[PDB]
């Protein structure tokens with residue numbers, strides 16, 4: 001299958017026509033996405049098969065063909081870019097300054113950008129173009145808008 | 157069955173559209189990976 005580094009759409013033909021259920025990042029021969037997108041299921045890339053390698057429902061992440069490769073973190077100060085890949089629309093970079101998700105186990109960066117659930121898995125980048133996390137797991141605030149965590153895995 | 161399709165390169169774009177605010181929200185993360193608001 002196609003193994004070039006970059007951002008990919010995650011699609012299905014099990015509903016009406018072709019539907020985009022999410023997005024993912026190919027880096028170092030490993031495909032990275034959010035768990036709620038695939039539910040840990042195998043993926044096809046042309047005539048090739050990508051099998052899951054690591055996953056965790058609580059972190060809401062899954063990697064294919066190898067272990068999680070993305071280790072960059074938000075520095076807590078600079079603006080970042082959501083490389084949004086919306087359904088039926090072209091990839092588009094949106095700059096924002098992340099807010100915070102305060103939890104009992106520590107603070108996490110969060111992006112206050114609202115895209116449909118089919119955009120889940122779109123990468124968030126730092127100034128050198130490194131992936132600091134994936135968009136798509138968050139909360140609905142008072143005004144009904146979506147605020148997503150900057151979700152990053154651990155590189156072994 | 158699910159399939160992947162390339163959508164682009166991962167690069168920072170100079171002069172991109174700048175939008176969105178930076179709210180500080182108290183949240184909880186359950187065993188199923190769902191965030192919720194603690195108010």
Ligand SMILES: CC(C)Nc1nc2ccc(C(=O)Nc3c[nH]c(C(N)=O)c3)cc2[nH]1
Pocket residue numbers: 036060114115116117118120136137138140144145146188189190191
């Ligand atoms: C209507 C407006 C607020 N827009 C809005 N953009 C969204 C993006 C993602 C999700 C979404 O559902 N994520 C998810 C599903 N499952 C998980 C899990 N951790 O299992 C996360 C929902 C959105 N709604």
